[PDB]
Amino acid sequence: SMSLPPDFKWGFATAAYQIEGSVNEDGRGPSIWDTFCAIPGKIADGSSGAVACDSYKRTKEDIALLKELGANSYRFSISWSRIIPLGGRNDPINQKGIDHYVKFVDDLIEAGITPFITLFHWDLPDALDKRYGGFLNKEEFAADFENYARIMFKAIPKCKHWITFNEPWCSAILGYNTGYFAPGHTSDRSKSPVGDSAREPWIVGHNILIAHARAVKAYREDFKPTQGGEIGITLNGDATLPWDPEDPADIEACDRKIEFAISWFADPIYFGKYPDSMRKQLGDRLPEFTPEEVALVKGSNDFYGMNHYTANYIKHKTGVPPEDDFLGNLETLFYNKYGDCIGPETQSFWLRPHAQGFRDLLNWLSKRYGYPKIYVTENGTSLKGENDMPLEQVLEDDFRVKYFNDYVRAMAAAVAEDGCNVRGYLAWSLLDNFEWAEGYETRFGVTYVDYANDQKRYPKKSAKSLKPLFDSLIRKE
Numbered sequence: 001s002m003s004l005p006p007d008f009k010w011g012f013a014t015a016a017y018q019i020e021g022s023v024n025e026d027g028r029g030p031s032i033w034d035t036f037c038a039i040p041g042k043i044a045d046g047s048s049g050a051v052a053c054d055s056y057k058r059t060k061e062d063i064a065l066l067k068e069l070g071a072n073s074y075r076f077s078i079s080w081s082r083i084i085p086l087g088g089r090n091d092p093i094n095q096k097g098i099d100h101y102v103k104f105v106d107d108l109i110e111a112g113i114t115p116f117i118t119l120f121h122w123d124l125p126d127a128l129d130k131r132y133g134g135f136l137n138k139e140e141f142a143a144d145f146e147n148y149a150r151i152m153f154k155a156i157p158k159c160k161h162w163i164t165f166n167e168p169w170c171s172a173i174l175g176y177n178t179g180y181f182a183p184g185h186t187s188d189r190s191k192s193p194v195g196d197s198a199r200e201p202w203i204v205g206h207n208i209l210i211a212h213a214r215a216v217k218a219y220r221e222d223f224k225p226t227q228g229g230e231i232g233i234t235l236n237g238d239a240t241l242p243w244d245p246e247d248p249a250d251i252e253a254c255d256r257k258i259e260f261a262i263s264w265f266a267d268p269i270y271f272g273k274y275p276d277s278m279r280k281q282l283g284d285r286l287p288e289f290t291p292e293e294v295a296l297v298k299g300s301n302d303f304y305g306m307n308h309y310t311a312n313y314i315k316h317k318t319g320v321p322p323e324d325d326f327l328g329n330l331e332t333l334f335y336n337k338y339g340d341c342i343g344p345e346t347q348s349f350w351l352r353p354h355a356q357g358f359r360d361l362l363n364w365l366s367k368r369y370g371y372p373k374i375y376v377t378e379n380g381t382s383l384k385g386e387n388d389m390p391l392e393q394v395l396e397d398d399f400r401v402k403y404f405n406d407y408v409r410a411m412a413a414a415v416a417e418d419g420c421n422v423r424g425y426l427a428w429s430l431l432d433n434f435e436w437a438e439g440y441e442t443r444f445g446v447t448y449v450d451y452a453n454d455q456k457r458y459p460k461k462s463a464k465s466l467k468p469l470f471d472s473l474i475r476k477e
């Protein structure tokens, strides 16, 4: 029923912009998020990644925290603009930036912690966006990304777990359909002077796939022979249930939703084509790969990186969807035809807990993609009103304890009962941190960070719950 293999990797996850602070220190150049946060109205509490958890200066304390919690693994990202402040292949490299991360990894390894390193977690160097529209220029972006990646592969050979992109769905849809995330492109001219919500998202997804696959080929050809290790992309995606369990169109739409959200990226990576359902709806707004691109992209995951948070009921729509539609001509809802609920609210409008969906989606993905090795690179939750609670109540985060309990056991059943090859689980997040367009109000941390008192760390009940939870699941031999 529930049991995990002895080598199982587990720990916590973070991202550079969300935690590091020191946004102008040691040569770092601006990212598209530094710029986006300077624009009134884009961040709900008017804040930015300035200061954040001050983790750039507190690596030693953060490592000691990981060790105190029992983690054997830690996922973090590299700020590209600390490595190449302007980002490009002909721009000057910042050795201080490199040395910071090389040392960090030496120190993690010395503490007995396996590093999982994300190259790109949304913080595109601003200059690349300004020069050529960043992801919108296929050849320029792929060349600059591959160059950046090779610098990191060469400098950090002790890392054996590399992630290219985090959640390209976010970068494409939220960055170029709705403008909710940097760089804020949308057709809506009351929010952005540039963008085309019907066309730019699909170009952005396409070109990220190309860049990913170049970085993977570089890793496999020039580094893996002598350094070993593995590389893949991390995709997010939520589970689906039919709004009307008797309606075959809703049942079909549960698959279609997942195809538009995840298979957009995974079908190219495993099969060398986009989902037929996407081709049908988007037609020539969805780019086509050339034969050379198909060969490059197909087979470009050593493992499947999975981020997962929630589930939705799916209600099919009829007729022709608007050109700005990205869901696949359907509606997502938290209540079904019979008034059944996904789960209670959290601080995030889009997140309700549903552990069964995690198990369901693990199965769906494993079946569609031939049982790849899966690392769960993010899973966790916010808690409604957490930012307003007194300390004693914040630390007693029973709701979050429960989220991890149910989601981790659901995953363990996916493994031991359903045969899914999950080999790691990284809790989002080690620390309360900057939650993008929501600012600091939305807390995902297993560790409370007191921003008013020098970002002092207090482990919550959840933080201490994970080690005994995994002790109950991971086989000794």
Ligand SMILES: OC[C@H]1O[C@@H](O)[C@H](O)[C@@H](O)[C@@H]1O
Pocket (backbone or CB within 6 Å): 178, 180, 350
């Ligand atoms: O309507 C788009 C919404 O979709 C959700 O799944 C995203 O995570 C939100 O961050 C976003 O604003």
